Every structure is written in structure tokens, then in C-alpha cells.
Symmetry: D2
Subunit: 243 residues, 4 copies
Amino acid sequence: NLPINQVGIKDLRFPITLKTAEGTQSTVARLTMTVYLPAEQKGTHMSRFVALMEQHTEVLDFAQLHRLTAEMVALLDSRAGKISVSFPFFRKKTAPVSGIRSLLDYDVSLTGEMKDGAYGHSMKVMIPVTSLCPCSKEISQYGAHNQRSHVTVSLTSDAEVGIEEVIDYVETQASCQLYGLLKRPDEKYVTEKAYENPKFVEDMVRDVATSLIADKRIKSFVVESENFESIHNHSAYAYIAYP
Amino acid sequence: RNLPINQVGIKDLRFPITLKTAEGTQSTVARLTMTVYLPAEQKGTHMSRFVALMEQHTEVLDFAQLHRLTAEMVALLDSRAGKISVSFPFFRKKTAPVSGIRSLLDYDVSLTGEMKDGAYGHSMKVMIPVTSLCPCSKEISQYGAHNQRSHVTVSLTSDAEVGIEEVIDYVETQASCQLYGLLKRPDEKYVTEKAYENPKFVEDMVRDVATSLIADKRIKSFVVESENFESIHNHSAYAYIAYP
Amino acid sequence: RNLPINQVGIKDLRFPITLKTAEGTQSTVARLTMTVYLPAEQKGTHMSRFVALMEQHTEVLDFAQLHRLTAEMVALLDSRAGKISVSFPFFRKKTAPVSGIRSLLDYDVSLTGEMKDGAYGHSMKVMIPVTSLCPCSKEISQYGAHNQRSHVTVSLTSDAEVGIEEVIDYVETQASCQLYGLLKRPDEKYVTEKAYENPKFVEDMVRDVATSLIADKRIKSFVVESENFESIHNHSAYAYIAYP
Amino acid sequence: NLPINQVGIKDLRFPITLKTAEGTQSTVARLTMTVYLPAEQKGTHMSRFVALMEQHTEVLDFAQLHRLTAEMVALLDSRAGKISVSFPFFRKKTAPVSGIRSLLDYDVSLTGEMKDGAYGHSMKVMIPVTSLCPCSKEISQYGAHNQRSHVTVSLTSDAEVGIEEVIDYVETQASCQLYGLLKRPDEKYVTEKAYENPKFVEDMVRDVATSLIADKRIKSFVVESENFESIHNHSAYAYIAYP
Ligand SMILES: [Cl-]
Ligand SMILES: [Cl-]
Ligand SMILES: [Li+]
Ligand SMILES: [Li+]
Ligand SMILES: [Mn+2]
Ligand SMILES: [Mn+2]
Ligand SMILES: [Mn+2]
Ligand SMILES: [Mn+2]
């Protein structure tokens, strides 16, 4: 026969309202929603996944994802299941000299999982930052190549770790973080800061991983960084998984 | 305290390759991710050496050469461990079921080689586009049945070589019906009917493929996914089996 | 000699928006490309001012506000001409044909406003996913007919406002059958049969939609494309009509 | 009734062998192949497009595309049609100090078009380069932000313009061009060169457009540049169309 680990729907696009520590915002999600299927059961009930999403008007947060995942495995009459919800996430930032405010966008995934009435949750957040090359600075009489970099942090904890917490962990460690709106003094600040704080992809993943190890709510994690090397047409890349 | 890095190197280097499999040799274009382990005490790896390796090597890619490449990499980069993953479109000559007219079909393949302390392991992933036809549709309708393209993706790790086409055949054997670039009128008639007579849920498809893979004694672990681009909704029906 | 630049500014700024149309207000996420004309004698534009504009403006997007935005942009950037293009998913509440159970469907929309010397013009593009069912398949087969999802994309420019949902209705009216997120057993029966009874080639679909658009006196030009993700091949059947 | 401008197949993936001035190479293409459909004709003949590609074993070049497009409109019995073929294109480069050789990849589209026995052709080439900001350099006491940039050149001519010619036009104008393989002295050269040759996106499109205007084989063109600004999470962008 063969049991199926997960069966359900993938990439249902759906508007959501999201509440986190700093505020509530409206965004647009892709959802994948699946349940365990026992060896002798032929199929699951595909329409119920969509039925569940249409019924809940509730704002999404850590508590609401748990409640959705519970109601899902109940509704589909299964022992286990997963909801993963992916979305762009906005945060208001303050330029470092002018203090002019502007949004930046991050890509987030939240997963909730039931196994035999036990719940687990995990999250993934992609944070774009500036990386600048220490080797380039050191060998060159002037200048240093630099590029946008995508730092992706996956983690699982028991206590809630906020999206913005993960963002701050990474942005703190970057050669320089990004802003949508920069005035001339802000551009000057950012250029010089990056140049004063060059980091290899190695340095970045180690620097971030140390911060996460220190956060005792975190049970496991992966930190990746991809740097879109401005002098090549391919990327430098690294990752650390823990434990 | 310093922290070893699981994998560091280059990602998404695009590179032309010639590939040799059981059915012949072909020229394709790959994307490569090439990384080694970095111990705590070492500040960085040697990034240009990954590209040097590809530029230097001229030989046709196959299971043996991927092994040699991965071993040569860890040595060149002065490391104890590493991975090469190579992703590319893969073509195979197909024949129409009625006419016998031939055309190519394209598949997406990734091959990974991995070294750990001198121990080599290898895995592979293949996405096979098939036709899926819904049994519930046919069953409840006085005529017709909704169908759609579906992507079946098989990831496996093995102790001995498993050929790309063997993975393709394990899947295509099980499809409601397989795809062809070029179909004449009678072929299209055959393909329409086959699919109608052989409706399979995503659940049925992942199960039929997993059975074949559990039975192959070379396969130490696998995942079979199938995604059905339901022709009646704007989302997919999805399932997967991981084994063991 | 210096060269004027047709359009210069920012591209793919991602930004949350609230959109007001005839059927109600909704919150979505857009990508913006915002550019102005640069005359020969000017070295560069003022890049931060494009983002300043978006941050400053708080009002709901609609046909009028897009006009105001584009005019405010060219003034802020001290230029004679420019474009704002805003791309986003767009949702609409649908109802199942038998049960009457409601669910959303998602559409991809771009709206463009353009200023030239104080003259405003606007265009729009909408991708509508539909079901397509092949007439040749049905016709030659003793049972069944291959079908698949297909993307119908309508680009138009108009002198007066044409609503997003109006474009959606011009297409969906013509489909072999339209899509629904949530379908019960009887709905699925209805949708299977409708599609079977109403087979249409990509050629038929582009033609039926173009007829509606030629007839609308607001539409000064258009393109209708349809792509059918043929469930029997691994490539698409494609057509388009440009008018006039 | 209504005539259809173009009807046929889209994104057929297909291996091709390509001959250009510097050599022959094997790559993988996407093809879109369409014909005009008269007002009272119901449908075209979809299988013949694929039949045509399978029959021709010939290496692709400017002459062969013309011949394919001719044979297509003949075979489908139509007055007009288009073949567009898209593919990654490799070129061998020489590092600027060490002279170590390595490939770089470019994205190319070639289009051939028949209208009532008259042929036309056009091409599109995306060239990735390094861009470095003159404003950043000028205001900062040290450093200058820089990023990978995608310069896309579309042109139509009567006489053949080679892919490599379009690449050279662009690479010559970039703050610095890209290489896959760079040794430490090469990295030093590239860092300093870019920094000595900062250009705005405005400067880049004007500099390239001037080069193309000077090429009298070229009838019309578009030059775009998108710079993946290393300090923002969005791109600077410009284009010039001519005439
Ligand atoms: Cl993510
Ligand atoms: Cl291109
Ligand atoms: Li921990
Ligand atoms: Li000219
Ligand atoms: Mn470097
Ligand atoms: Mn069904
Ligand atoms: Mn057909
Ligand atoms: Mn700048």
C-alpha cells in the first residue's frame, strides 16, 4: 500500500493580514497545506484545505498558525499535517544620517506542523544586505568590490522568535544593511561604513550563527549567505547548520 | 570561537557540459554549486580554484567523472570534504505511440557528488513531466475528465550508479500518459484515450513510483513528489513520499 | 553630444498597496517601475525622489490616483515626461457553479500611467488563468479530451477607464471553462462537462476575446495572447492578436 | 472572423549547435515559432513546427535562421511568420593581469521574420558588467558602492551584426567587465579600474547608444541597463530607443 508523508495543495496564493511585535500589516501569501495519508486510504479531501482558508478571517500570528494547523488535521481527519505560509514582509527603517523613514522588504516563510497532537513551528527569513570584500580592499590602492547579498536564516524554536528579531540579528552583522531611501549624507555614511566593515561570506555566516547560538529559544538553524559578486557572474555562497 | 562552515564556495556558475549516459552522449548547459568544508581555524577558502577546476577539465561528465571531479576538488581546495552539484536540462529521443515519428523530450536533472574524509557518496534528482488525469472527474461526469500537465520529481541516493533514463522509465511507466513533443492525429487519439482509461490521483502516482523505487536494491533513500497543475483550479494538488 | 534618455529611474521596488476598484477595496503587494525622461543636457535624475513619492503617498490606488501620482512624479523629479508601472496580484470573490460556495481567485495585473508634456495616458495588462479544452482531441477520440490550464493575457490602452474585473469578465465569458479555488463534487461535475461541451483552440480563444475588445469603444489599442500549457506536450500552444 | 498576427508554439526547449565568428558551440535553446493565420482559417498545424526542428540537423547561424524561417512559412502554408531562439552563449575571456582564460555566459535571443517573401532579423543580448557609483565615490572619503549590472541590447540590422560585436560594444563601456576566473593581481586590477571609471546608469546607456549609432549596419535599437544597487533592495534602470 504505502503511507504518504504529506498530501494536499501547493502554492495557493491568498491575501493575509499579519500581526507581529511591531505591528499589523496586510500582505499576499503562497500556502502549501498537507496532511499525512494512511497506507490503505486512497485520497485526501482537497477542497477542505481551501475551505479552511476561506473560513478563517483571523489575523495571522504564531498563535493563529498553531490554531489553523490544529483545525486542519482535525478537519481532514488525519494524524499529522503541515501548513507553510510564504510572503513578502515590510519593516519601516530610519536612514542613518537624515533619519528619513522608508520600508524595506524581506521574504518570510512560517511553517506549522502537527504530529499526533504535538505541535512544532519553524520559520525562514531572507534578509538582503550589503557585502564588501576584505581581500579587494586590502590589495587595492583604492576601492573595494561590494554587492547585494541574500542572507537566509531558517530556524526552529519552542518559544516564539519574532521575524524582526531575526532581521536584527542579520542586519547587525552585515558590512552594511539596506534602505530604500537614502539622501546624499546617508549614501556617504553607508559607503564608508561598508568599507570600514568588509566581510567575506565566511565571516558573515559565522557572525550570524554565533548570534543565533546565543539565543537559547533556538533549537536548530541554518544560516546561508549568497553574495552576488559584483566582479563575477556567479555567487559566493556558504552555510552553517546547527546542531 | 571560530566555527567550522559546513559548505563554502561558489553557486550558480553556468557552464557548458557534455554528458555520457547509457543511451549516448549529449551537449547541455549546467548550473554548478561547488563547495568544501571549512574548519574552525581557517579564515576562508580559495574561490577562484572552483572555477579553475571546471576550466581545466575537459572530460565528458558521467558517474565516474563526477566522482573524480569531486575528489580532485577537495584536493585542489586543500579540504577534507565537499560537494559538487550540477543541474541541467536533459534530452531523450522519444517515439510517438501510433505513427512512430520521433522527437526529443526535455527533463530537468541534478547530479550531486560528495566527499567526506575520503568516502564518496552521490545522489540525483530528476523532474519528469507527465500527463495526469483525474479519476474523480471521469467517475462523476457523464463525459470527459479534467487533466493537466504534472511534474513528478524523484530524488534518490544510491550506493551503485542508477541511470538517468532508468528514473525516467520508472516514472513514465506509471503515468496516466507520458508526453511527446511531436504527435500526429492518430497519436493524439491514442494519448487522449490512454490518459482517459488510466486516471490517477497525485496519491496514486507517488505510490506507484515509490513501489518501484523501494524494490530497486541500489536505492538507499528517496523522495518522490508529484505536482498536478489542476486544470480546474489555480493551485496544485501535491504529494510526496520519503523513504525510509 | 549627449543624448536624451527615454526613461530613467527605479525598477522593481516592492511596495504594499491598497487598491480600489468597482467591486471593493483590497490590500496587495506591488512591484513598481518609476521613470522620467532625461533631456540631453542633464547628467542624471534624482533617484531617491521616486521612493520619497511612494513613502509620502498614503491614498488608495485607483485610476484617478494613478494619474495624480504620475503627475506628481514628473513635477517632483523636475521633468517633462515619465511613467509609473505598478504590477500586483489581484483577487476576486468567485462563486461555485453548483454549490454556490465562495472562494477567491488570483489574477496578475499591471497598471501604467504615463505623462508626456502634460498629456496623460494609461494602459493595463491582466493575466486571467482559464481552463482550455482541445476540440481536435474530443473530435478524434471515442472518449475524453485533453485539457490544461491556460494563461490569457490582455494588454490594452484606453481613453476612458476600463475596470480590471471588466477585462476579467470579457475573458472568462469566453473560456471553455473558468477556474475556482474551491469546488464541491457537483461543481467539479459541472466544470468537467462545461469544458467538454465548449472545446476551444488557442486560436478560438484569442478571436472570441478580440471581438469583445474591438467592440468596446473605450479601447484604442490592445493585444490578446493566450498560452495553452498543452497537457500532452512539454511546450505551449500560443497565439496573439494585436489591434489595430 | 479576425486574422491572428501570430500562432504556433512557445518555449519549446531544444538543443542547438551555434556557429558565430569566433567559433562553434553547443547550447540549449527555447524556441517560439509562429505563423500568420488568415481571417477565415480555423487553426494552424501545430505538429509541423516541431517536425521542422527535428528534421534540421544544421548548425545555427544567421544564414540558417533565414532558411529555417523560409521553410517554416512554406511548410505551414502561411504568408508570414517568426522564429525566435533564446539561449545562453559562452565566450572565452582572458583575465587582465594573469591572462588566465575562462568562460563567461551571456543571454542571447535571435529572431527571424518572413512577411510576404521578405525576410527581417533582429537580436537581443544581455551582458552582465560591473557598475560603480560616481556620486558614492565623490562624497565618500574612501570606497564607492558598486554592483552587478545587466545591460540588454536589442537591435535590428540588414547586414549581420555578430553576438560578440554587441558584447564588445558593451564591455568596452562598462566601469569594469566580468570574468569567472580572477587571480589576486586580477582582482586588484578590476577593483581599481572600476573605481577609476565610475558610471551612472545614465552614463552607461548613453555610452553604449553612441557606439551603436556609429555602427551603420544598425537600423534600430534599444539599450537598457539595470543596476542591482548594492545599497538598496531595488534597481536603478534606464533605456534609450533609437530612432
Ligand atoms: Cl524565505
Ligand atoms: Cl536576452
Ligand atoms: Li541552542
Ligand atoms: Li543607424
Ligand atoms: Mn573579492
Ligand atoms: Mn479532479
Ligand atoms: Mn490537442
Ligand atoms: Mn549611488
